[PDB]
Structures are given as C-alpha cells and as structure tokens.
Design a protein around this ligand. Structure first.
Ligand SMILES: Nc1nc2c(ncn2[C@@H]2O[C@H](COP(=O)(O)OP(=O)(O)NP(=O)(O)O)[C@@H](O)[C@H]2O)c(=O)[nH]1
Ligand SMILES: [Mg+2]
Lengths: 264, 159, 140
C-alpha cells in the first residue's frame, strides 16, 4: 500500500536468484511502477541496478511477469542507463509466435531504441506495420509516429507499409495509419492534397480517422456521418451560406452540449 | 546450473546456444542484448545466458557475472587478428570477483574452417595454462555440426 | 494543426484528490510539484459533481466518478470533446469489466497490475491506441 523506495529497490534484489517466483516478482515490479507513478525520484545508479535485475526475469516464461517487464522497461527507459540490453529480447518477442506479447513488445522496443540503433530494427518494424493482427499493426504505427522525432529520414521510408495498413477495416489501425502518413507528409503540401483527394472518394471507415482527416482538410464538408463525433468535428470546422443547425440540434443532450455551446 | 556464455562478436555464441536448444542451425542476427535459454543435458538443466559480443554490449556483461557457476568463452578460431583482443577481454574477466570460483570453459570454435587455429594454439594465445585458481578446459567445437558441444556440457557438469 | 497527439494526461484521484494514477503525456506540467498542484486544483473544482466536463487551466477536462474515485482525461481546449469522452469511457468500462465489480479505491488497489496494463492499452504517449473497452480487457 504505502511504502518506501529503498525497501522496494532492495527486495528487487531477489530477481538475481534463479528459482524465480513469478507471482512475487511481478508484485515487486508493480511496487516499482507505483513508486514511479507516484512521482518518486530514483537515482541513475539505483534505477540502473533495478533495471538490470528486471532483465534477469526474462528467464521466466510467466506471461504476467513478461507484461510487467514490458511496462517496467518503458517506465525506466529514461531513468536508467544502458536500457539497450533489452533490444534482442524484444525483437525476439515482437517477431515471436504469441500475439498477446507482440504489440506490447514493439511499443517497449521503440521506447528504448535511439536514432543510432534504429537501422537494426527497421525490417521488423516494416513487418509489424503490415501485420494482420491490429494490436501489432497499431502498436507499430504509433511506435513509428513517436520515432518521427529522433529520426525522420528513416521513418519516412516506411510510407509504403503504412499506406498498405491504411486500407485496414480495423478502425484503430486505419486511424493510426492515416495519422502516421499525415505526420510524415505534413509540410509537403502536394502529398497532403493527394492524400486528401484519395480518401474523399472511397472515404474511411474510422471515425477517428474521419475526425483527423476533416482537420486535415481544414487547411485553407459532409455532415451526414453516422457518428456523433464526426458530425460535431465537421460542424466546428465549417464555422472557421452556412448551415449551423446541427450544432443547435446538439445543444439538447447530455454533456455534448458543452461542445456545441463552447463554440462561438 | 547457471552458465554465462560470452566472447567477441561473431564467435558463434548464439549459433551454439540454439544448436543446443533446438538441434537446429539458425540464421543469426548480431545479438544486441542477450538470449537466455534452458537446456537439458544428462539430468542437469543449464540456464545459458548468451550475451552479445559487440562493443556496446561487451560493456554490459558485468551485470550477468553474479551467480554464475560456469563461463563459456567462445572464440572464433579462424580470426587471428582478434585473438589478442579476446585474450585481453578474458584476462580481466578472470579478475572479476563475482566470477571468482566459476568454471572456465573455452570453446575454440569454427574448427571446421581450413585455417582455424588449433585448440592448443588458442590455449597458448589466451594464456589458459596460467590459470591456477579455478577449473578450466579448452574444447574444439563446431557449432554448426554440433562437434564438441556436448563434450563441453559434460566437462561443465563435472565442475 | 492536426495530430495523433490528443490526450494531455490521464488521472485517477481518491477522495482527498491524492494520486492513485497519473500520466502526463507532454511538457505542460514539467515537474511532479506542479502536477500535484494541478491535480489538487482540478479535484477542488470537480469533487462531488456530475457535470462531466470542465474548462480548467485552459484545458478541457473530462471526468466521471465512482464511490471513492475520480477519473479524468485531460486535453487541449482545441481538441474534440467527444474523442476525450471516448477515452474516459474506455478507461472506466475497461476497468469495470476487468475488475468484474464496482470500481473503487479498495478494488482498484487490489489489482494495480491490471490498471497499469490497461491504461497502457488505452493511450500510447498521448495517442489513442484502443477506444474499445473489450479489446483492452482482452489484451490483459
Ligand atoms: N563456419 C562456421 N561458422 C560458424 C560457426 N558458428 C557460428 N558460425 C557462423 O558465424 C557467424 C556467427 O554467428 P553468431 O553465432 O550469431 O555469432 P555471435 O557470437 O552470436 N555474435 P553476436 O555477439 O554479435 O551475436 C554466423 O554467420 C554463424 O552462422 C561454426 O562453428 N563454423
Ligand atoms: Mg550472440
């Protein structure tokens, strides 16, 4: 419940022992995550020691422990030194047989990967982007989005796998896919216009994609959408021969009326 | 039994491990990290930590030292330029307090290649004769055939 | 300017507006001090209320409650309220189905693993990952 940092970093030293208790060790990982979520500052040295203890848990095949490991990796990625040590384990897990682990692994991998090491994993990234499992595909797309900061020139190269993914029936995948595409193509005006023209016909099946695409269209139309969110988005877009009826018609409702009124 | 397997990059450490685990010769990528696997040989379950040998990773082996009962040090017998470097890495590894009593098994590997140095040659170059403080053994291996691998597991289990 | 980055933060606060769970997905509240300050601020405004939406500190705050707990999704005033709302609903429904129970401080602390993993299934770095509660519950 309510505990001290030093104690927990201590019991973390049980991870170095061979006959691993998955339940117990996962509990301790949870204590660490909590300490961190609470805002407790861990030093470079103690963080690094705990990180390297956690790696040793990769010997255990317990699923919950594995998942907790992914989390721990993402959370300590910025406070511990030499997190690169997990790269192999994650590329393994991400390419592995079991889908429950695949998306999460991509996310964690990309968190500990820096623009220097990006080249080593590019092939697997392109593979995960086009995977049929939406968990994996979505994870890889958002991952790439994040990676657009540190290294843009490597990720722009991935527009093809991205485009392939943007046809997905899965609404999240489509969302992330078109999102990523824009994030790359933003600032090359031509490719954006083409981008828009493409989905103006044979539009999308994602409400979120719809919303963001409307927002895209707004840079210097149709409110018949069957999702509340898109209709609103469209509306607020339009007002910056008008038809401001649908807003007013939204004005009568639970908690949607804030959005309506807030406009103007 | 807890085993740490290291050596310079491209020595054949992962090839060895997955030959042992899968009876298969896999197509490796450089290991940026570790692989950890459990292997059964004659009633012993060896937990083998294969830790990548390229420089960045080499700097990290010390975290895997603690609790190690035995050390497999893989050498590419065909690479004469890097043998001194191997010698240097291994010598200071021998000075590590967490590795103090661990059994020391050298694999002179890629013995299958025509100009591979012999195990005796390697023994002279690595300075193995000068270890008096713990058990050592050198074994010629070919990880692709599997030659010498189980002779290694055998020696190790007799720590 | 359009973005996949929508969610600014996700909070779960107890009756004292103390922090059960928090993620801040950008640099608005750089240090824990000013974060906790923000959290007190928004708790003091939203405690014992049903209004499920608020403008505070120039940000849209979307929220809802259970017995001892408050759930918040925070984003820019320039975002779409209904999208934030899909995040909040996802988080609360997901947590329900997960716990198979009324969602309260006792129950939630009983499984923190689940909470962590679930929030992680919901938002990735400010991006909405999965809006569907069932998908999220499945992934744990
Ligand atoms: N001819 C021959 N090639 C071998 C032998 N063992 C491994 N190799 C090959 O030499 C290379 C070494 O691969 P690998 O085992 O991955 O080396 P490593 O020690 O794991 N290196 P790293 O630390 O960078 O992962 C591969 O091309 C592998 O197939 C062997 O006994 N004979
Ligand atoms: Mg290797």
């Amino acid at each position: 419940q309510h505990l001290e940092k030093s104690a927990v970093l201590q019991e973390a030293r049980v991870f170095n022992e061979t006959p691993i208790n998955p339940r117990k060790c996962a509990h301790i990982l949870t204590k660490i995550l909590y300490l961190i979520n609470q805002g407790e500052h861990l030093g470079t040295t103690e963080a690094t020691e705990a990180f390297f203890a956690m790696t040793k848990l990769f010997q255990s095949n317990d699923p919950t422990l594995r998942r907790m490991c992914y989390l721990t990796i993402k959370e300590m990625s910025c406070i511990a030194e030499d997190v690169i040590i997990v790269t192999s384990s994650l590329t393994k897990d991400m390419t592995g047989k079991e889908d429950s682990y695949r998306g999460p692994a991509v996310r964690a991998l990309c968190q500990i990967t820096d623009s220097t090491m990006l080249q080593a994993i590019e092939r697997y990234m392109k593979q995960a982007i086009v995977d049929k499992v939406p968990s994996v595909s979505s994870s890889a797309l958002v991952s790439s989005l994040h990676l657009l900061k540190c290294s843009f020139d490597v990720v722009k190269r991935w527009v093809n796998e991205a485009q392939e993914a943007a046809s997905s029936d899965n609404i999240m995948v489509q969302y992330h896919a078109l999102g990523l595409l824009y994030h790359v193509r933003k600032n090359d005006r031509l490719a954006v216009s083409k981008m828009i023209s493409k989905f103006t016909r044979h539009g999308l099946k994602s409400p979120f994609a719809y919303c963001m695409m409307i927002r895209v269209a707004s840079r210097q139309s149709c409110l018949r959408n069957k999702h509340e969110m898109v209709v609103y988005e469209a509306a607020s877009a339009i007002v910056n021969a008008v038809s401001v009826l649908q807003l007013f018609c939204s004005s009568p409702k639970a908690a949607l009326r804030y959005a309506a009124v807030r406009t103007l | 039994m807890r085993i740490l397997m290291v050596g310079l990059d491209g020595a054949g450490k992962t090839t060895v491990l997955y030959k042992l685990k899968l009876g298969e010769v896999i197509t490796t990528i450089p290991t940026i990290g570790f692989n950890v696997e459990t292997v059964q040989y004659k009633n012993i379950s060896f937990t083998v930590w294969d830790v990548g040998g390229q420089d960045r990773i080499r700097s990290l082996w010390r975290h895997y030292y603690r609790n190690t009962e035995g050390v497999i040090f893989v050498v590419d017998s065909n690479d004469r330029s890097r043998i001194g470097e191997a010698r240097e890495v291994m010598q200071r590894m021998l000075n590590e307090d967490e590795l103090r009593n661990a059994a020391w098994l050298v694999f002179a590997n890629k013995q299958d290649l025509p100009e591979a140095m012999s195990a005796a040659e390697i023994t002279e170059k690595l300075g193995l004769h000068s270890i008096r403080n713990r058990p050592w053994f050198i074994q010629a291996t070919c990880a692709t055939s599997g030659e010498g691998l189980y002779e290694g597991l055998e020696w190790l289990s007799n720590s | 300017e359009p973005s996949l980055y929508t969610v600014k933060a996700i909070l779960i606060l107890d009756n004292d507006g103390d922090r059960l769970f928090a993620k801040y997905y950008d640099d608005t509240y750089p240090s824990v001090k000013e974060q906790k300050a923000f959290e007190k601020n928004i708790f003091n405004k939203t405690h014992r209320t049903d209004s499920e939406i608020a403008l505070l500190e120039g940000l849209t705050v979307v929220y809802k409650s259970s017995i001892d707990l408050y759930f918040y999704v925070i984003g820019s005033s320039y975002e779409n309220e209904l999208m934030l709302m899909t995040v909040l609903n996802c988080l609360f429904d997901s947590l329900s189905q997960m716990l198979r129970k009324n969602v309260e401080k006792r129950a939630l602390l009983e499984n923190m693993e689940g909470l962590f993993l679930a929030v992680d299934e919901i938002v990735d770095g400010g991006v909405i990952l999965e809006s569907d509660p069932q998908q999220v519950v499945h992934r744990v």
